[PDB]
Design a protein around this ligand. Sequence first.
Ligand SMILES: *[C@@H]1O[C@H](CO)[C@@H](O[C@@H]2O[C@H](CO)[C@@H](O)[C@H](O)[C@H]2NC(C)=O)[C@H](O)[C@H]1NC(C)=O
Ligand SMILES: *[C@@H]1O[C@H](CO)[C@@H](O[C@@H]2O[C@H](CO)[C@@H](O)[C@H](O)[C@H]2NC(C)=O)[C@H](O)[C@H]1NC(C)=O
Ligand SMILES: *[C@@H]1O[C@H](CO)[C@@H](O[C@@H]2O[C@H](CO)[C@@H](O)[C@H](O)[C@H]2NC(C)=O)[C@H](O)[C@H]1NC(C)=O
Ligand SMILES: *[C@@H]1O[C@H](CO)[C@@H](O[C@@H]2O[C@H](CO)[C@@H](O)[C@H](O)[C@H]2NC(C)=O)[C@H](O)[C@H]1NC(C)=O
Ligand SMILES: C[C@@H](NCCCc1cccc(C(F)(F)F)c1)c1cccc2ccccc12
Ligand SMILES: C[C@@H](NCCCc1cccc(C(F)(F)F)c1)c1cccc2ccccc12
Ligand SMILES: N[C@@H](Cc1c[nH]c2ccccc12)C(=O)O
Ligand SMILES: N[C@@H](Cc1c[nH]c2ccccc12)C(=O)O
Ligand SMILES: *[C@@H]1O[C@H](CO)[C@@H](O)[C@H](O)[C@H]1NC(C)=O
Ligand SMILES: *[C@@H]1O[C@H](CO)[C@@H](O)[C@H](O)[C@H]1NC(C)=O
Ligand SMILES: *[C@@H]1O[C@H](CO)[C@@H](O)[C@H](O)[C@H]1NC(C)=O
Ligand SMILES: *[C@@H]1O[C@H](CO)[C@@H](O)[C@H](O)[C@H]1NC(C)=O
Ligand SMILES: *[C@@H]1O[C@H](CO)[C@@H](O)[C@H](O)[C@H]1NC(C)=O
Ligand SMILES: [Ca+2]
Ligand SMILES: [Ca+2]
Ligand SMILES: [Ca+2]
Ligand SMILES: [Ca+2]
Lengths: 803, 803
Amino acid sequence: YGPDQRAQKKGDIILGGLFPIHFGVAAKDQDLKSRPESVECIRYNFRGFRWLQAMIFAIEEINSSPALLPNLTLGYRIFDTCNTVSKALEATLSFVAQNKIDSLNLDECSEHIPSTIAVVGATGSGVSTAVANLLGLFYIPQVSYASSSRLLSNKNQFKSFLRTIPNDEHQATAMADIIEYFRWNWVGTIAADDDYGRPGIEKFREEAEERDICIDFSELISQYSDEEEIQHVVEVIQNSTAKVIVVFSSGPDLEPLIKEIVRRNITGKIWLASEAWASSSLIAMPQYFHVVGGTIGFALKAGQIPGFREFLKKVHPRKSVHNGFAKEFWEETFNCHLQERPLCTGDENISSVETPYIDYTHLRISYNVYLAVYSIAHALQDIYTCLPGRGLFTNGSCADIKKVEAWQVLKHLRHLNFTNNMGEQVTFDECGDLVGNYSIINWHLSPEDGSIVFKEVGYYNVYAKKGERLFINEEKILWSGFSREVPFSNCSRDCLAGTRKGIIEGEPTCCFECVECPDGEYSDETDASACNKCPDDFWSNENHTSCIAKEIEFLSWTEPFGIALTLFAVLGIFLTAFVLGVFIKFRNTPIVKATNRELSYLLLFSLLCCFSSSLFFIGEPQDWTCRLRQPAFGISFVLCISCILVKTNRVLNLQFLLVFLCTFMQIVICVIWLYTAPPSSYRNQELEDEIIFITCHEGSLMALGFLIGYTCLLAAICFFFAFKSRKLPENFNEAKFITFSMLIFFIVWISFIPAYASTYGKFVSAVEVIAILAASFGLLACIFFNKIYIILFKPSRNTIEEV
Amino acid sequence: YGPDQRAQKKGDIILGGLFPIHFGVAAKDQDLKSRPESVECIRYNFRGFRWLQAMIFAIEEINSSPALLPNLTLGYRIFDTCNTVSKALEATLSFVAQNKIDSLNLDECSEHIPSTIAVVGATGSGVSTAVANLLGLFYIPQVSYASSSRLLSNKNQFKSFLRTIPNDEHQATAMADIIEYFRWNWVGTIAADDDYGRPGIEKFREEAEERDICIDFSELISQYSDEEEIQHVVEVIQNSTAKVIVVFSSGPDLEPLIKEIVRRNITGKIWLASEAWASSSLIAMPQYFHVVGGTIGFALKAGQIPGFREFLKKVHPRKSVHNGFAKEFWEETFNCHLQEFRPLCTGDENISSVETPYIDYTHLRISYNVYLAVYSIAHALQDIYTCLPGRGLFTNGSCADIKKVEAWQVLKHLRHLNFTNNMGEQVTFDECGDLVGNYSIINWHLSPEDGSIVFKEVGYYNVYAKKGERLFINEEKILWSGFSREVPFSNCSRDCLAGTRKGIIEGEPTCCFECVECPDGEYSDETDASACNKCPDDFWSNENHTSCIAKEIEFLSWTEPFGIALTLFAVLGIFLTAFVLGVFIKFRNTPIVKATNRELSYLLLFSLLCCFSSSLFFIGEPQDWTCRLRQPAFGISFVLCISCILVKTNRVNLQFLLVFLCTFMQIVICVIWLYTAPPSSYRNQELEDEIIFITCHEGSLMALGFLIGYTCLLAAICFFFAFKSRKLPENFNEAKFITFSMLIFFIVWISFIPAYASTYGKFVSAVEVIAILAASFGLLACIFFNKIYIILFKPSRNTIEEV
Ligand SMILES: *[C@@H]1O[C@H](CO)[C@@H](O[C@@H]2O[C@H](CO)[C@@H](O)[C@H](O)[C@H]2NC(C)=O)[C@H](O)[C@H]1NC(C)=O
Ligand SMILES: *[C@@H]1O[C@H](CO)[C@@H](O[C@@H]2O[C@H](CO)[C@@H](O)[C@H](O)[C@H]2NC(C)=O)[C@H](O)[C@H]1NC(C)=O
Ligand SMILES: *[C@@H]1O[C@H](CO)[C@@H](O[C@@H]2O[C@H](CO)[C@@H](O)[C@H](O)[C@H]2NC(C)=O)[C@H](O)[C@H]1NC(C)=O
Ligand SMILES: *[C@@H]1O[C@H](CO)[C@@H](O[C@@H]2O[C@H](CO)[C@@H](O)[C@H](O)[C@H]2NC(C)=O)[C@H](O)[C@H]1NC(C)=O
Ligand SMILES: C[C@@H](NCCCc1cccc(C(F)(F)F)c1)c1cccc2ccccc12
Ligand SMILES: C[C@@H](NCCCc1cccc(C(F)(F)F)c1)c1cccc2ccccc12
Ligand SMILES: N[C@@H](Cc1c[nH]c2ccccc12)C(=O)O
Ligand SMILES: N[C@@H](Cc1c[nH]c2ccccc12)C(=O)O
Ligand SMILES: *[C@@H]1O[C@H](CO)[C@@H](O)[C@H](O)[C@H]1NC(C)=O
Ligand SMILES: *[C@@H]1O[C@H](CO)[C@@H](O)[C@H](O)[C@H]1NC(C)=O
Ligand SMILES: *[C@@H]1O[C@H](CO)[C@@H](O)[C@H](O)[C@H]1NC(C)=O
Ligand SMILES: *[C@@H]1O[C@H](CO)[C@@H](O)[C@H](O)[C@H]1NC(C)=O
Ligand SMILES: *[C@@H]1O[C@H](CO)[C@@H](O)[C@H](O)[C@H]1NC(C)=O
Ligand SMILES: [Ca+2]
Ligand SMILES: [Ca+2]
Ligand SMILES: [Ca+2]
Ligand SMILES: [Ca+2]
């Protein structure tokens, strides 16, 4: 009844089992020249035999214990799948022989042909899919220990499939979390071309696309990939700059690629291993460690089966009548031949040979096999202890254990809730899945043995909230097996401050160019997509990483030039005040009485007014400061000129009013300009990019020009009268002064436009304040220095009458 | 045995058949409260029954024709799959009952049914995978007509699977070609969660990422997706700006989402339908044309089966004894209930009256595939029949006995099959059991006459062409979204412009970008650009940053309002100096001119000539020869003038020797400065970025400073020697006039310091060409004015009048 090599025992209820005892089938090409024969299997699987023994041990433990299924013995019929759909399908056809016989009406034997109540499912997800398609026809519940494909959660197609292993959605999310944790964004993916690698790679692709992770390459491999595809994938890996490779595959499918990569000696790659090969003895070979060393993988939660190791050590080909795979196990363990290659004596010790069979540190899928067997057993017990009237069937009817059927066991397995030997609650959700934690391991080299050790470096809590599932202790991770520094696996290096991201055409967003910011903008953060513009009166620092205020530039009172000009003007005001004091003190003197005593007082008052008005130009330019800047000096200077002309007006109450009339025109022009186009406070920043120049535009230039021309007119009118008086030195020869006053005014303000009409910053104010001070000082000196010297420094020479 | 309803005919050779006569199973909630009864099917599939009739017609035509398998009749055993794995697996168990009895050795019915030797395959790719897993166990060939998944090309798993339909790799490549043809880069993808949609959308993902197409979303749908999943898919669809949605699905799995989208009235989307639902009656209903109208899809090559339509029209529930589905076909067509409230089927109705997809077709595409699969099996059988011994395909050149043929021999002959179909083309399966074929491209329109959706051919796909030339599309025949004739826009962002660049948006793919404007000095001219280009020197970016123009050259020259005035003033000065020379030359034999010196005055006049001429050296564009002597020219000339003028004072021919000695040191230092480090025409571009100044350097700046210092010291010495001589009225008090000349020169060459230091550019030569001639005028119009005016108009007031 099916394959010759089997492990079967009799009992009241028979449970089927499918384990990979070989890694695959012989690669003999069927040319169909002769009728095809059964294809042999090649490489023994000690781990798979351990899984089979876990199933057998669980069933024997159940039978020994009288508290679970009293007066009912459990049987089994376990076959070898060789990781192939064909072998497992032959075994499954053996399993459903009675169900198919009765459904197909082909009986038109009963004691023989035992009926399988439940099947402990396959390892591979494709194998489990193929088996479940046939098993769901008859509603035989199938509990898998290792198939973690999310495609088996579809209960519309797989009506009777449950599993004691978490499906791969959480594992793909966990790999995405691992990549996000180490700040990687340039990765490549490799997956097996089966129902396991493809959905997991797809889920990882979705998760990583969410987290702004860029996948450089994505290739598919298989156990039967020929030289061309393996070479192509090797070249794809070699060309890629991504160091982190995410692999969703098993051992047998990844073996050819790893062998080729070792042959071509590709090093420096970081491998993110799925659970199927993270603990695989096919790839964790020491000779491959220079390639696959430092692999970060996933491992399920380890379980505790108390008397399991003794059961494993007790296997013997002669004393294992029920287990048929024991003979081949002995032959492959001790490298001999059994007769019912040397001849095995049958007295060897399995502890003297190193194999995965007993040289294990954690039971992960073995505990899953145990849990699946115990789940079926507990469902059967729930059937047995059903109190009538409270059943799960129609009208609360309870099934009979003496005539139980597969669909009733399946119904009870859906509503199953029991506690395992580790105290945890074992329950299948609406999709038949069994959620569980993940462990995180790293591949190291054992210094004492030279083999590969799996060092736990973290875990993955599936019961935590999003973003709190992953914990990694990076201090325990040896990158590439030797290093202690986190590798760089970004497409491009980060852009520093003052630099932005530039697009590389035809490449993902993770690959960019660093472009310096323009001089008008800045960028402070690392890896910024744009340079923020410097706002308001700010400018960019020489490295465009900060904003620096645009310097406001002006003639300050505290500035050295401003200090000098203010002190010089104050000294002039003090000097004219002193001259006034001497004049009033010595008012009773014929020399002063000879000149216009009262009018000279108005002249010197206007002189002091001009000296003070010179201080208007220096300082902070406000609207009021430069509103009365030009016209204050205008009126003061025209008043001084009018006073000088009237004092010299010897050719003529009639003098003070004449001066008032002369200054009335100037005051009228000034007030007309003020009411029409008042000067404003310019804020000129568009002269130097980094400097703000605060000036004061005169509003309408025509009014200022007209005022200046008018002042020149009242200067030239006095100049003509002064010129003719050079031959008449009557009042102590004042012709040499009045001519000199107009001359120095004209010279100072004619020798100053090249200095004036050259600057438009702050020197345009200092130069013109210097011009005002110089003209006023010249006027003061010429008019009053000689007169005050004659009055004071010449007391004896104080002649009563002049010429 | 097996399914109750079936089509069955007895013969020497029996062919299995799997057709989806129903669209699915009844949505029954299996609570397992009662023993699970066989689930029933609900919706009828007239296309599936047409396919079944195609198989039956092919077998009947083969039997009638004596040129194919003479003296041998073909039987069939055809079952309904209802698009479900379970029903097809029941049918496959019926198919392999005999083989599996032989293998299981359960025979420990003599002829329950003649052994099935071939099975014309299923429709769904998952259903075909499930059936092929079981059929490959017994090496029973399976020729599918519709399963086009690339997973079935794996001959390591599917040993006996062949198909008359091409796999979907070419169709996904064709979707990528269509997307790139209309220049889209922002598309969404929807696939069916089965073995057809998933690998197809994965191949499309690979191809689209190869062509720089960005996929926005990627969702999976199913016939049994609940309301939550459909709702989430709908919000994902309408939360996106991608207008093109590429769908790899069938009619049943896409119906729920389409119905929901119609319910929520989402319009404007472009549908890229795969072959499975491009012609689906489930989706092509007129109610949905406002959503799925204007769909661009794929279709295979239609084939011509001559007498097929008559065979379809000849169906009858009472004359078709072999066909068991004919009764249900009649019931579903005429909406009645045949004898064993709906009316009673009299059996005299006309099938041509009712509009069902049965005979209402325009192109047999999968029906031709069914016909071709049957004929492929028949031709392999014929090849077995007409084999001459010694020229066979088996071990010793032998071949099988057709009277006892086995399924594996038929499979072997099908691998090496090469025959010509009725249409005259070669039918052969490659190493993967695949038939390569062309694709057609159709568009969903609306028929104004009937309202039904019509599939208008708008292109094709040529899989026998070189890569890149496979796609051909006639856009003028495409009605976009069913009404519009404008190609839709489905890019993530609008394209940039010329004077702008691309800006990275963080978290969005490379197809989504900003349009940051290029900064000043850099330009771009392409439609889109990832970086701003900068042209080389002598060029600056335009006002729109599109192109960059020549950096205009700024310097002092002629033919401008400033240069013309300066050269006019220079020629005026040379004119008055020539006039003065003529006055001194004509009236040379007079005592007046022979007051200071009769000949040294001529040397001074020549020096003034040279000083005036040196002013034109500063007005030209600085060349090598220009300003290597421009400053030396004025230096030497003015030193000569001062050397003449201080000797011109009397009581100092030793005068010429003294003048030459004074000028010799200046000439020597000028020659030394010129030879050691000559000033060079330096190209200046640092003051203003948009324009370039052509200035010239000075070489040894300290040499120039020393030259001007020597000149000013000599002038100061001349002024000092005339400082204490204004009393004597020698030669009409020339001491006062030389004092005036020296003072004028000093004010002109001391008042330009702020102009020189502040302003840099073209107005550095202008301030020189206005000061040089001003100082020269002061020297000329003061020293010689007192003599030219004396002897110009007056009766020369002389003969030692004041000498
Ligand atoms: C590689 O790129 C990632 C981005 O994908 C960088 O991660 C960023 O790191 C900075 C500071 O370390 C964080 O402020 C960002 O939030 C991170 N971005 C993301 C998306 O998480 C990582 O730093 C880069 N590594 C190197 C070496 O440059
Ligand atoms: C799954 O992993 C989580 C996280 O490691 C485990 O939660 C821990 O449980 C132990 C014992 O109950 C506590 O002492 C710790 O404080 C928990 N850590 C947490 C909550 O972060 C959990 O026990 C594991 N197993 C299950 C079945 O949840
Ligand atoms: C597939 O499509 C191509 C192109 O549409 C077909 O090639 C045409 O073949 C006919 C005759 O067979 C020629 O008259 C045309 O000029 C061809 N068109 C081309 C090359 O563009 C081809 O016949 C179709 N079928 C197959 C099986 O290849
Ligand atoms: C959508 O984007 C694509 C590419 O992102 C644009 O296609 C480009 O079109 C221009 C001119 O038609 C060609 O020169 C390029 O070679 C095309 N690029 C590619 C990758 O094919 C398309 O024009 C855009 N459509 C818009 C903006 O409406
Ligand atoms: C202080 C000045 N306001 C603008 C200066 C224009 C200027 C700058 C440089 C040179 C010259 C000048 F040569 F034309 F004088 C004018 C001012 C205000 C009011 C009356 C004035 C009368 C005479 C002179 C200046 C006057
Ligand atoms: C033409 C003139 N070259 C100006 C040099 C810099 C400068 C620019 C503006 C002002 C001054 C100065 F006031 F300091 F002189 C110097 C020059 C050439 C050779 C000899 C000269 C002797 C006297 C004056 C000018 C002389
Ligand atoms: N999960 C894998 C099977 C698997 C899990 N762990 C393993 C360890 C070894 C071998 C296979 C496995 C699958 O679905 O195919
Ligand atoms: N190609 C589809 C089957 C298919 C083709 N055309 C169809 C039309 C209707 C229904 C199904 C189909 C698959 O792989 O499964
Ligand atoms: C990888 O690199 C090799 C050698 O540089 C080159 O021939 C090949 O085209 C590249 N790409 C792939 C996919 O192999
Ligand atoms: C392979 O590469 C490693 C570098 O890690 C080097 O140590 C070793 O010698 C190489 N071996 C061969 C056979 O190239
Ligand atoms: C869709 O967008 C709305 C608002 O525009 C938001 O509330 C909702 O969460 C989004 N859903 C999805 C699936 O994007
Ligand atoms: C659906 O939308 C179309 C156009 O977008 C409109 O003509 C029609 O009336 C709408 N129907 C309903 C029921 O909203
Ligand atoms: C099939 O046979 C024809 C001859 O009729 C030949 O031209 C063609 O090459 C053959 N095809 C193959 C794949 O051998
Ligand atoms: Ca028990
Ligand atoms: Ca690319
Ligand atoms: Ca025939
Ligand atoms: Ca994103």
